[PDB]
């Protein structure tokens, strides 16, 4: 009655039967954009259940010495069905997101991941290593795209900040003896209405090993990672000719 | 109806005092147990002090009021300071102009990036002295060049007229100047991270400087000369101090644990990582 | 009266302008459930988390 | 004129004086705001968030920081064994720094309130075992035994499907506030000391691994406040930023 | 005396500050004032009313600048032909300059509202056609092609009795306000691209010019408000004035 | 050809939603554009040279002498207002001295 | 009471004469239409303004 | 402004007076007072023993 | 012209005269010239007891 | 990747041993005939 959960949005439908409670990020569900917040004029486009749904991107491989990895949203899935084209065609957009990242083994390993929601998640380089050269993040790794990119540095989050503090935002733990997936719903979170998908990314979504992944030789060795996105309220603006980037 | 299918769970409260405890006694069952948690929902544990041991009643008259976000922001802090040298590598012309960053000086910086969203109004105080704490009969023009408006170029820049833009004219002899600034941002709020681009277009390494920088953020010029046509024989160094009052501030973060780098962004001593906590020898001795 | 320009009750002014006006006393408002309790089904304090 | 006579305080710049300034821009008006989740009012909320404790802060993990974010327990050869401790002081050095309630309350002078400890166990499902965490009082120094921690505040922690448990540090001080511990006179205001010990053992079968970790997250209970704002000592400035 | 303590700002000058000042000629009275025709009370008033827009804001018209009030149009002999192109950009160097509104808008930092650009087609009434009027929203550059500029905002414009038609510039951004657009990083703000395509073509009999002009007026909208005063670009003290 | 500016809006041209439009029209009355000090004159007097050596200037009242106030009173034809005049005084390297 | 002799409501003065006064809240009243739409028969929005 | 003129006393310093002055910490609140015995209110208490 | 700071236990004194404690980010500090009346400010009971 | 943008269900084994993959009547005509390759290819009904 709390382990056991179903998500059904649009045509898809996710089942789990050993889950950990769901968690509302900052307590707030999403919501289409309100007359008194919005700016732009247009009547804006809210495709519904074509954008709405379940979308499963790359699957990731837990080795015993997995740094951790992050995807940026709604980068993601500016490339993916219906939704990114409607990301690609308008200027503006906005939505919420229900993530749910699965992960199963076996009542005989053992490993802990923190599953996080960090908002306007802006990475760092090493500068050089010294930190006499002031250098930048290549488009490659500021949005990964849909396959996510890898942590360097996972206790700084690669970014000058301490993952042992990455709690105080929305996230949810998958330790194998206890759940095998984590979700977490999110609402718009912007210092404006609506936004380019294309320019901005509004949150990063951080898998990290706290506990490294575990078990004795002869158990199945292969312990994927598969994360499922759903946007919610997805609204669309300012309507043109597609443009990638 | 021909067409069928087309038709917060967190509320403030005023906390004045620390919660106070209740007297509790012994509890012996099965069924209920307060001291088992399951961290893995991502909800802190709800579990108290009389539910882990026997409490007596405390009456906790303990304030909650010096940690309000706004006296915790609301104390000048040092943001800036610009010297004009009257012989040297710098602007030897009697005349500064300098973009508005706050993001110069670690204790500030800090404090304000422990949140990812903030809204507020300031009140910027100006101490202006000699190089070595000395005051002298000078007499100064501070002013405010927002963007798009014609920065001054010289010591009698036609800007200077200051026919529109906010000018404030004191003497290094005054006390210091002090005036309140309003939440200028075309935005909601100020954010000092935008994990994003300003522009459209390829992002070639080339101008990979771009990724982070939000102009949501960048308020304009703040110039500075000494009143006359003749160049001034003192030195002077200007010292600028914020107090941010009226704020509101969204989605906490966690704090900074590497010394900072440079203004504009999160760039770490990649070869020297320090641990967030000192370390000890064996963890079953202090 | 004044202007209501504000950044966002018990302040001090005396220019036209809102924002001018001191910071004044700060209210004891919190909200922690929001930070310390997001979850979808509220567990309670005496039944285990997880059943 | 009004006759008026200048008082000591005149002229000089206060940085915390909450005064009045004259406005720059005449009629201007900000930008109306918006909606936007996760707003904060009182720094004590955040305080009552769970954040990972760096019980094992050793010298030799620096370089591998990762391995400092939880602690092992195995199998044991002996009994009632120590498996762990250290202080409960939240704003000294140590553990609790890389907690946000320890690094919020650096910025502060005193503190006052009960704290909490919830440890979450990461071994596999088949693992069992009991472990007895207690929590001394200032006055003895680290516990020689369980048979003589046993005699503080405690609770004895039970694996199953419930992963973690919560240690209670009731706060139990002379004075209604703690000023932050550090060697010296100032060690009047230490917390006291928390150790685990084994209960039973790390019991495990053929098959699963015979050592498995615990994840410490820390935080502040209800009562918990802090006064008298002050600059942190975990920031620096060595050099210039450009 | 009353007991004072003088604040920081004490003898400062604030060209902005709104205070009282003595009055150098006591019991004066003003001459009385008499009605006058044309009172205005907000800029806002001014922004509303049309202006030529510079379109044919070409290097070699510099010498002969009559002709950048109007652009061209003609028999073509291709279909779908771009006739010209500009940004809607307010407070940016181009054709809006020559706007009292692009002018009036350079005082304030910032802009928010919906624009509007009317065409009057100045042609012989024997000359009739068709245009595709489109606003590109930002992300685009300019339209390669009609077929691509037609799906964003646009006007089919259709002469006869009624010389002009109007293009609405709905106000579509991220933010409440934009500062204004240049080169950079401020091409954050950037409002979009104005683009004019042939729908069918400039059809004449014999007997009428092949080439006609229209003029391009533009002015702001019921939304429209700035705000943040400022010094404009657009006027300089090179020398003395005598 | 009439003289009148286009009345058409938004909502005649394409599909609008709603927007409750809060934004201030206060700081574009003139009032608030003109209530801003700038320069319109400056004084020398020096006590060497070809000026005024003799101690005391005689300066006839026009406020046209510099550009940004001029143009932006030129915006209108007639205008009625008080004024405040404040004078900022020092040597020509900006010190102060007891005079 | 003052004098009224200000070259033209929510000002401040401490002198009898009221020019001496500030500037005050500026009033954001506005007549566009004599400057937008100064013709005789008033053109509607509808129906095309020539016919 | 307002109208002043400065009076003799201006600036001076004496130990006695009585006014107010700008408080350094805002919004602070001293630790609560416990009832200890043994209170004094007037150096009168005192030469009476 | 001078500065006076006020350093709480807990928080870093400063070493030289261009420490960053002198930023004063949340310190209480007065900035004053030796030419101005004598500084003065009001201080609460801050004792833990 | 692709199967993902059409209907379906993500099962998760468990105490549940089965689970139910909806095969909901999506057509143009109110009612199919038997498909086969060739023109009755036109009432096919998709693909699990
Ligand atoms: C008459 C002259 O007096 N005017 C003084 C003055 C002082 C400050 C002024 O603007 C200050 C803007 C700051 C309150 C906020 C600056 N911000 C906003 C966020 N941000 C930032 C910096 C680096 N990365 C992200 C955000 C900033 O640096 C303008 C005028
Ligand atoms: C005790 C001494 O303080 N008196 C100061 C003072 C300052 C200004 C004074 O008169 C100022 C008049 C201005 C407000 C208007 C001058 N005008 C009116 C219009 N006008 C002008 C100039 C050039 N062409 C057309 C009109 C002007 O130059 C008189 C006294
Ligand atoms: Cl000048
Ligand atoms: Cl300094
Ligand atoms: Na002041
Ligand atoms: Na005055
Ligand atoms: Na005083």
Same mark, same amino acid.
């Given at each position: 009655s709390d382990r056991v959960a179903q998500l059904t949005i649009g045509n898809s439908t996710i089942t789990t039967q050993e889950a950990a409670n769901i968690?509302?990020?900052?307590?707030?569900?999403?919501?289409?954009?309100?007359?008194?917040?919005?700016?732009?004029?247009?009547?804006?486009?809210?495709?519904?259940?074509?954008v709405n749904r379940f979308f499963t991107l790359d699957t990731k491989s837990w080795a015993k010495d997995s740094k951790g990895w992050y995807w940026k949203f709604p980068d993601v899935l500016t490339e993916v069905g219906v939704f990114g084209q409607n990301a690609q065609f308008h200027y503006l957009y906005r939505s919420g997101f229900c993530v749910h990242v699965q992960c199963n083994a076996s009542k005989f390993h053992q490993g802990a991941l923190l599953v996080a929601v960090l908002p306007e998640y802006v990475l760092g380089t090493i500068a050089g290593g010294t930190g006499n050269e002031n250098s930048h993040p290549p488009y490659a790794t500021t949005q990964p795209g849909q396959v996510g990119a890898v942590l360097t540095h996972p206790y700084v989050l690669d970014a000058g900040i301490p993952l042992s503090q990455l709690t105080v935002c929305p996230h949810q733990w998958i330790n194998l003896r206890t759940n095998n997936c984590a979700t977490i719903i999110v609402p718009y979170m912007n210092t404006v209405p609506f936004d380019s998908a294309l320019n901005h990314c509004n949150f990063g979504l951080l898998v990290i090993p706290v506990v490294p992944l575990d078990f004795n030789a002869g158990a199945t060795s292969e312990i994927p990672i598969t994360v499922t996105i759903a946007p919610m309220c997805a609204e669309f603006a300012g309507l043109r000719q597609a443009v990638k980037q | 109806? &021909? $067409?069928?299918?087309?038709?917060?769970?967190?509320?403030?409260?005023?906390?004045?005092?620390?919660?106070?405890? %209740?007297?509790?006694?012994?509890?012996?069952?099965?069924?209920?147990?307060?001291?088992?948690?399951?961290?893995?929902? =991502?909800?802190?544990?709800?579990?108290?002090?009389?539910?882990?041991?026997?409490?007596?009643?405390?009456?906790?008259?303990?304030?909650?009021?010096?940690?309000?976000?706004?006296?915790?922001?609301?104390?000048?802090?040092?943001?800036? $300071?610009?010297?004009?040298?009257?012989?040297?590598?710098?602007?030897?012309?009697?005349?500064?102009?300098?973009?508005?960053?706050?993001? =110069?000086?670690?204790?500030?910086?800090?404090?304000?990036?422990?949140?990812?969203?903030?809204?507020?109004?300031?009140?910027?105080?100006?101490?202006?002295?000699?190089?070595?704490? %000395?005051?002298?009969?000078?007499?100064?023009?501070?002013?405010?060049?927002?963007?798009?408006?014609?920065?001054?170029?010289?010591?009698?820049?036609?800007?200077?007229?200051?026919?529109?833009?906010?000018?404030?004219?004191?003497?290094?002899?005054?006390?210091?100047?002090?005036?309140?600034?309003?939440?200028?941002? &075309?935005?909601?709020?100020?954010?000092?991270?935008?994990?994003?681009? &300003?522009?459209?277009? %390829?992002?070639?390494?080339?101008?990979?400087?771009?990724?982070?920088?939000?102009?949501?953020?960048?308020?304009?010029?703040?110039?500075?000369?000494?009143?006359?046509?003749?160049?001034?024989?003192?030195?002077?160094?200007?010292?600028?101090?914020?107090?941010?009052?009226?704020?509101?501030?969204?989605?906490?973060?966690?704090?900074?644990?590497?010394?900072?780098?440079?203004?504009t962004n999160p760039n770490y001593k990649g070869n020297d990582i320090?641990?967030?906590?000192?370390?000890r020898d064996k963890i079953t001795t202090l | 009266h004044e202007n209501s320009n504000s950044a966002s009750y018990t302040t001090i002014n005396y220019y036209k302008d809102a924002y001018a006006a001191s910071a004044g006393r700060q209210d004891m408002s919190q909200d922690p459930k929001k930070f310390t309790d997001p979850v979808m089904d509220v567990i309670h304090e005496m039944a285990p988390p997880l059943k | 004129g009004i006759p008026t006579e200048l008082k000591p305080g005149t002229n000089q710049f206060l940085t915390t004086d909450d005064g009045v300034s004259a406005p720059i821009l005449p009629g201007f008006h900000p930008t109306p705001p918006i909606h936007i989740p996760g707003e904060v009012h009182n720094l004590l909320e955040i305080c009552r968030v769970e954040t990972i404790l760096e019980v094992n802060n050793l010298k030799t993990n620096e370089t591998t920081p990762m391995q400092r974010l939880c602690f092992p327990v195995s199998v044991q050869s002996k009994t009632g064994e120590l498996c762990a401790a250290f202080r409960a002081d939240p704003g000294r050095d140590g553990p609790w720094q890389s907690t946000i309630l320890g690094q919020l309350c650096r910025y502060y002078?005193?503190?006052?309130?009960?704290?909490?400890? @919830?440890?979450?166990?990461?071994?596999?499902?088949?693992? @069992?075992?009991?472990?007895?965490?207690?929590?001394?009082?200032?006055?003895?120094?680290?516990?020689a035994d369980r048979i003589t921690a046993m005699l503080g505040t405690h609770v004895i922690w039970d694996f199953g499907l419930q992963s973690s448990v919560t240690l209670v540090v009731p706060w139990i001080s002379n004075t209604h506030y703690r000023a932050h511990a550090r060697a010296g006179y100032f060690d009047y205001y230490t917390t006291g000391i928390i150790t685990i010990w084994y209960q039973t053992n790390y019991v495990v079968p053929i098959g699963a691994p015979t050592t498995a970790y615990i994840v410490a997250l820390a935080a502040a209970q209800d009562n918990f406040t802090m006064k008298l704002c002050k600059d942190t000592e975990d920031i620096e400035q060595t050099a210039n930023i450009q």
């Open positions: 968690v509302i990020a900052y307590g707030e569900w999403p919501e289409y954009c309100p007359d008194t917040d919005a700016t732009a004029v247009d009547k804006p486009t809210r495709p519904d259940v074509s | 109806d &021909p $067409i069928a299918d087309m038709i917060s769970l967190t509320a403030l409260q005023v906390l004045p005092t620390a919660a106070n405890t %209740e007297a509790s006694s012994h509890r012996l069952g099965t069924g209920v147990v307060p001291a088992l948690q399951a961290a893995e929902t =991502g909800a802190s544990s709800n579990a108290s002090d009389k539910n882990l041991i026997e409490t007596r009643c405390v009456l906790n008259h303990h304030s909650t009021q010096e940690t309000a976000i706004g006296n915790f922001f609301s104390r000048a802090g040092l943001v800036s $300071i610009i010297t004009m040298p009257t012989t040297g590598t710098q602007n030897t012309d009697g005349y500064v102009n300098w973009d508005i960053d706050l993001m =110069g000086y670690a204790q500030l910086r800090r404090k304000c990036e422990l949140f990812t969203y903030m809204r507020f109004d300031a009140e910027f105080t100006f101490v202006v002295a000699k190089p070595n704490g %000395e005051l002298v009969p000078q007499l100064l023009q501070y002013m405010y060049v927002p963007p798009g408006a014609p920065k001054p170029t010289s010591r009698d820049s036609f800007a200077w007229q200051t026919a529109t833009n906010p000018s404030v004219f004191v003497k290094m002899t005054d006390p210091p100047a002090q005036v309140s600034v309003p939440f200028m941002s &075309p935005a909601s709020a100020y954010q000092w991270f935008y994990d994003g681009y &300003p522009t459209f277009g %390829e992002h070639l390494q080339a101008n990979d400087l771009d990724y982070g920088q939000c102009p949501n953020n960048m308020m304009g010029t703040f110039s500075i000369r000494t009143v006359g046509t003749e160049k001034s024989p003192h030195s002077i160094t200007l010292r600028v101090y914020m107090r941010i009052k009226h704020v509101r501030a969204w989605i906490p973060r966690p704090l900074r644990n590497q010394p900072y780098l440079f203004k320090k641990c967030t906590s000192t370390s | - | 002078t005193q503190w006052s309130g009960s704290l909490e400890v @919830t440890f979450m166990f990461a071994g596999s499902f088949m693992a @069992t075992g009991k472990m007895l965490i207690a929590y001394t009082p200032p006055g003895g120094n680290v516990p």
